[PDB]
Amino acid sequence: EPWTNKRGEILARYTTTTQQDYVNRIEELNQSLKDAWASDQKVKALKIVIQCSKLLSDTSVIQFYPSKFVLITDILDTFGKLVYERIFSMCFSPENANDTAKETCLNWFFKIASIRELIPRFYVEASILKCNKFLSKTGISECLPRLTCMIRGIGDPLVSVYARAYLCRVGMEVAPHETLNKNFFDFLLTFKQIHGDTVQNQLVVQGVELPSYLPLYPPAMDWIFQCISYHAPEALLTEMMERCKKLGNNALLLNSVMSAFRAEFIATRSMDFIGMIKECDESGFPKHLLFRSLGLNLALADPPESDRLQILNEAWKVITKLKNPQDYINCAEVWVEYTCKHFTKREVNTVLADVIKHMTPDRAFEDSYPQLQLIIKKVIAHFHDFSVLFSVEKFLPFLDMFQKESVRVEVCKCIMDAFIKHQQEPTKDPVILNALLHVCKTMHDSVNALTLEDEKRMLSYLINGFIKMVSFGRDFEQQLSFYVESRSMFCNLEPVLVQLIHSVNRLAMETRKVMKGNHSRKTAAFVRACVAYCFITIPSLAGIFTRLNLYLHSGQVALANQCLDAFFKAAISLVPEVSESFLLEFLCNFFSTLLIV
Template sequence: MCKLESVPLDFGDYHPLKPITVTESKTKKMTRKGSTSSTSSSSSSSMMDPLSSVLDGTDPLSLFAAAADPVTTAPPTDGARRKRDKDESSAVGSDFEPWSSKRGEILARYTTTEKLSINLYMGSEKGKATTTGSAVSEKVRTRLEELDDLEEGSQKELLNLTQQDYMNRIEELNQSLKDAWSSDQKVKALKIVIQCSKLLSDTTVIQFYPSKFVLITDILDTFGKLVYERILSMCVDNRVSLPDNFSPESVNDTAKETCLNWFFKIASIRELIPRFYVEAAILKCNKFLSKTGISECLPRLTSMIRGIGDPLVAVYARAYLCRVGMEVAPQLKESLNKNFFDFLLTFKQIHGDTVQNQLVVQCVEIPLYLTLYSPAIDWILQCIAYHAPDVLLTEMMERCKKLGNNALLLNSVMSAFRAEFIAARSMDFIAMIKECDESGFPKHLLFRSLGLNLALADPPENDRLQILNEAWKVITKLKNPQKREVNTVLADVIKHMTPDRAFEDAYPQLQSIIQKVITYIYDFALLFSVEKFLPFLDMFQKESVRVEVCKCIMESFIKHQQEPTKDPVILNALLHICKTMHDSVNALTLEDEKRTLATLINGFIKMVSFGRDFEQQLSFYVEARSMFCNLEPVLVQLIHSVNQLAMETRRVMKGNHSRKTAAFVRACVAFCFITIPSLSSIFTRLNLYLHSGQVALANQCLSQADAFFKAAVSLVPEVPKMISVDGKMRPSDAFLLEFLCNFFSTLLVVPDHPEQGVLFLVRGLLNVIQDYTWEDNSDDKVRIYTNVLHLLSAMTQEAFIYHVDKVDSNDTLYGGDSKFLAEINKLSETVVSQILDHLKTLGKEETLKRQSQLAHYFFNTILAHGDLRNNRLNQLSVNLWNLAQKHGFADTKTMVKTLEYIKRRSKQPEMSHFTDLALRLPLQSRT
């Protein structure tokens, strides 16, 4: 339990609480929840306890009024009164920024998303004993019970309130105060004010405390005004009201007794914080009792604040006292200074264990915590600095210097003192800023406060360059600037670099600014909403530099953009940047540069997604095609993206297209069909025709799929013998073989067109292969024919091994019809004839090895896909086996393994004919 030290204070002869002389104080633990500390007082004097006569019928308020009537004070002379009135009226002018101008900023700045609670003390419902006695005795009894009820009422706690709910509750209390007052329930009004004042001792959601202070003191101001106007209204004699600058002698006894009554009620409040705030709220009422009442109360209230343990609560209590002090007695500067000096004495508490533990519990960092003090300290210093001499301001600055970790105070000094005073000592302030601890209060905020002063008043001319150099050292270290700061810097650079095209000589520096901005701003919606960012890019008039800057921006976007976007701000800005890169391409542009630009643009295209708005997505691709038509890789990417869009539509519709989605996928197919011919790479076109035809087929666009496949067939004759691959010329046969094998796989499921005849696409492709000019030393033509046999063999099955969903292939259309099978057999015979003719041409000595390899390859094809129960085909296979071994070029191991495979197959059901075949296939050894 703490010990209270008695501090004798002289409050003057006419203070309303003068009769209660405290000579010894000791702590007494109170059982009632919510009270802080209270004292039981005993007096060694013979002064009567004002509450001891509670039952004897004597009104203690009347006794106090008789014992300490302030009217008996000798009035000052008229000249002194006029001088004092003049000082009061001229003390605060229009150049003093009022508290009301700061209120909105504090409420907007200090907010929270955490849940708040509020304690409401409901009136006690205990019954009142009715006893016979004098009217005066009953009046005293009722009054004392009401006063006791102020603190012993039942408590109601509202939990989990949002910030807005909390503010609404406070506003309800404010309205309840006005309602109680208007209905002449003065005690209830006082109870509401006490309840609200107690909330200022609660710092459980500490970041909201400044806003809470604003809301609660609004209620206190209302209460103080109501009490003052109530007493003032009682001073009317013969319908003549008191003048504005009245003296206590003009106040009648009834008004004085009522005023004393209010002070006595407040004196009975046990808790320190509500007692302080409520008395401070009616401080102006001392004017009704004594001319020196205010000047005597201010030091006593200042000393009362020393009993508040929490430094944040204490500094706001001092701010409130300074506020009411400036309103009622602005000429009493000594009280203001005393409040500030007391705060300096307790400043080290901010870095003490108690506060640090509280911050750990609430997960609040010390820099954020220190900013909570700013409104209170700024106000105290503003009051002190108003019309203060330079000597006092210098003393304040020197006292702040002596404290460690004084950045918070230094910032408030620069915010409150006159700009001329700060500017004249700018180098001194810079030296103090440099000594401050960066971890406590950010230095950039200190330089901001200094800069605001230097914008209003010029520093000494000899110091200006040094000031800039010192500030710039800090500015260059700043990271994560906000949108407003970035926009301000860019706007200022544009302003200074635009005249006389000065930017042409500073491209490296301007490029560095862009790189720094995109290094620390990853949110491109925020970046492109910076008003001056795109105008800043327009200063890069030199094309090569402009393209490099655009590439930097696109690289940053691709690296940091995590999710697809449809933000119109981002899309418009990046389309402009990509268009700038695309338009720089000309006939002299290197292929590597084209690839780099195309890769960046493709990265942007892949990050654009309008979700389920597929039509908007297609419109974007159409616009991109028109903008980037000179970069072939971008067009390829657009075709792939549109095909993917069509398949996504199919997935969403689960393959069952409506009239609208069917029209949409046809539009996607049309986009691809129109775009593919503009490409220069023939194999890129072939593969895209095949890919797009597959997408059209999957979406049941059969006529469009036929158009893609026909285009692919007609393009095969244009395939050159040599193509460029990674800058080197290579034969195209291998690429053509790979494409045709993929094409054959697709043709299996493509249904015949009813007007084009049986297997019209296969026939057309075979004709193209036949007419194509193949290299003499290449066997790719035979390998292609062999793959055609694979396709024709698969087509003879009653049910194909794979299908396209909701597309009827030829197995369904023909159902194993004999005419269809006959056509396949004719084609097969033609293909076999072509293969055998080619084998004959390889009978020369230099091509015997190729003949052996092809004969064995063809034998394997017949073995896998042919019906060897057919005597002609069986004999053909034997001939091919012998041809492969005829000249000794066959691989013996391979031939042995093949024969073993045939023997294993012969043991399977319905494969007995393989036994006869195996007996007819001799193995020849090399001799």
């Protein structure tokens, strides 16, 4: 709703080819306005503001015009505020207003209403529209229709549409409380000027092409439709769309409709808009943008059940043909959200095939990592059962798509977070096990001498969260094999080794507990194997106090299963390498342990 948001949008989108020096000049004129007004030179302020608004009547640098509009209108609103608070200083009700301030503001109005040019008059009058409150209870209402009609004198449709944009902006900012509506109709009455020959030869003389000229309208038209349609009734919107249908090359018009109109309203007209976009022409505004806006609206609204599939079909029947991958993905990322939302794993698998096909050639994915990231985030979000998510035959190749290191590790962290936060029971499914093993391998492989400690901590948390979600039921030999394989996989990362050592010891104790002692010969061999594993692993840990503590716990766990000394010898031999309190407690624990050895 606020203009500042759209101000930033237009500024960020229309930085075009100095332009920085030109904006510096605009702000210098604003500063001169402020200083001159501060020195009680009112006429200098008014004249400089006329000088500024005169720059919006010219369109020499056609591409940059919307940002010129934003900046010069900012100075124009500065003038409005200055004069308004000055008259308020001289001075509630318009009748209650003293006659002196009334005289000053009438002088202001007669000063502005004697300018030679139409566009400066319109700008410097709509700027101070607020001041009309003092003259009468109905100054704004009686002055606004005249302002809308005055635009008819502007032929160049770009300037006309942006003047309507500013007028709607001031009407919303000053007297938001129907009259503004006519603006749009008048635009329609002059819409034909957009493709009318005069504008075309103007363009061809300046050195611009229609597909680039038209994209200068979307901001102004979007603001116009947002202002008029705001809380508009269904009948008014129906009439607007009805007029937008017959109006020749309504491509850009439909784009503005889908950008401004509520997605609730655009979704239920999905079939109509699909047909209209089909009827449009590809020479001017590309159809991919229109289908992108339709997808955006669908993301917020669900069309009727009777044709949703068909919509999808038509969408991907055209979206698939898009021959510029950069153009393709920018319209497919929005559609894939609906694909996942409204259709089963087969449809999402097919669209995944399509997107891999489109982005793979010439490594075009290299440039569109952000959108691939967003689509994969959405894909993961839509799926809760990871078994299904890995049943999709084109999940792993998509992951392989991210050949870059940083992005791939980021995606691995994301999927691991999804797993840990949406998995409350350990899994034996070979598919899940394999997929998670692959992703964790590629995630770990990132660490290196330049890796940061907190990065190591977060990755360790991820891999430990995984390894904590792998269980083999009663089977303990296979469970020990899994742990030893995980050790082989996660050698470099140390906390994973710590967790795996704790886990092998806990498994040995569980094997003890699931038989109430008298470990059978097979289990005797198994327990000897696990304790040998723990012995082999411990020396690898880099820490010192942790190494000693784990040696002690390994001694306890080995003593627990009648496997009788080497661990304590190793710990004692390590002692000389070793903070005083930690060592004291370690030796106290060692002495207590030996009390039963």
